[PDB]
Amino acid sequence: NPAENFRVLVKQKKASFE
Amino acid sequence: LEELRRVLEQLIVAHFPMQSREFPPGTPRFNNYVDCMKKFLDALELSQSPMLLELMTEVLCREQQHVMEELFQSSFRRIARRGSCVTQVGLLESVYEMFRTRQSFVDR
């Protein structure tokens, strides 16, 4: 479920997001 | 009769990937999680079906006291008071066989 969380995270603030 | 646990797995997988606190407590996600765990716990308590017992056990046996394990132990009490002795023995054998962390399964 947090798969979608980080999927939208990395393209909702446009960061590599380690 | 196997479709039951198949769909059980296929649904519960989409709910609790790692923890129950990974979604903040007191929040709609957490709130619905406590609702559904109560629902399974009670429906199984009445049912006394094994496969549900294991499934909710291992998902419980990931993080210590993250899914309200007091309800868990109370459900054990109200189950072990009910049911035929042979039924209880079957449940015990099933949850013994699931044993083979990995330790925490039986422990809790």
Curated annotation (Swiss-Prot), chain A:
ADP-ribosylated by PARP3. Phosphorylated on serine residues. Phosphorylation by PRKDC may enhance helicase activity. Coiled coil: none annotated. Induction: In osteoblasts, by FGF2. It is found in: Nucleus; Nucleus, Nucleolus; Chromosome. The EEXXXDDL motif is required for the interaction with catalytic subunit PRKDC and its recruitment to sites of DNA damage. The VWFA domain interacts with the KBM (Ku-binding motif) found in a number of DNA repair proteins. Individuals with systemic lupus erythematosus (SLE) and related disorders produce extremely large amounts of autoantibodies to XRCC6 and XRCC5. Single-stranded DNA-dependent ATP-dependent helicase that plays a key role in DNA non-homologous end joining (NHEJ) by recruiting DNA-PK to DNA. Required for double-strand break repair and V(D)J recombination. Also has a role in chromosome translocation. The DNA helicase II complex binds preferentially to fork-like ends of double-stranded DNA in a cell cycle-dependent manner. It works in the 3'-5' direction. During NHEJ, the XRCC5-XRRC6 dimer performs the recognition step: it recognizes and binds to the broken ends of the DNA and protects them from further resection. Belongs to the ku80 family. Heterodimer composed of XRCC5/Ku80 and XRCC6/Ku70; heterodimerization stabilizes XRCC5 protein. Component of the core long-range non-homologous end joining (NHEJ) complex (also named DNA-PK complex) composed of PRKDC, LIG4, XRCC4, XRCC6/Ku70, XRCC5/Ku86 and NHEJ1/XLF. Additional component of the NHEJ complex includes PAXX. Following autophosphorylation, PRKDC dissociates from DNA, leading to formation of the short-range NHEJ complex, composed of LIG4, XRCC4, XRCC6/Ku70, XRCC5/Ku86 and NHEJ1/XLF. This is X-ray repair cross-complementing protein 5. The gene is XRCC5. The chain holds residues 593 to 610 of 732 of the full protein.
From Swiss-Prot, chain B:
It is found in: Nucleus; Nucleus, Nucleolus; Cytoplasm, Cytosol. Serine/threonine-protein kinase that acts as a molecular sensor for DNA damage. Involved in DNA non-homologous end joining (NHEJ) required for double-strand break (DSB) repair and V(D)J recombination. Must be bound to DNA to express its catalytic properties. Promotes processing of hairpin DNA structures in V(D)J recombination by activation of the hairpin endonuclease artemis (DCLRE1C). Recruited by XRCC5 and XRCC6 to DNA ends and is required to (1) protect and align broken ends of DNA, thereby preventing their degradation, (2) and sequester the DSB for repair by NHEJ. Transmembrane segments: none annotated. Autophosphorylated at two clusters, the T2609 cluster and the S2056 cluster. Autophosphorylation induces a conformational change that leads to remodeling of the DNA-PK complex, requisite for efficient end processing and DNA repair. S-nitrosylated by GAPDH. This is DNA-dependent protein kinase catalytic subunit. Belongs to the PI3/PI4-kinase family. It comes from the Eukaryota. DNA-PK is a heterotrimer of PRKDC and the Ku dimer (composed of XRCC6/Ku70 and XRCC5/Ku86). Formation of this complex may be promoted by interaction with ILF3. Component of the core long-range non-homologous end joining (NHEJ) complex (also named DNA-PK complex) composed of PRKDC, LIG4, XRCC4, XRCC6/Ku70, XRCC5/Ku86 and NHEJ1/XLF. Additional component of the NHEJ complex includes PAXX. Following autophosphorylation, PRKDC dissociates from DNA. Interacts with DNA-PKcs-interacting protein (KIP) with the region upstream the kinase domain. It is linked to Immunodeficiency 26 with or without neurologic abnormalities: A form of severe combined immunodeficiency characterized by reduced or absent T and B cells, recurrent candidiasis, and lower respiratory tract infections. Some patients show dysmorphic features, severe growth failure, microcephaly, seizures, and impaired neurological functions. TPR repeats lie at residues 17-50.
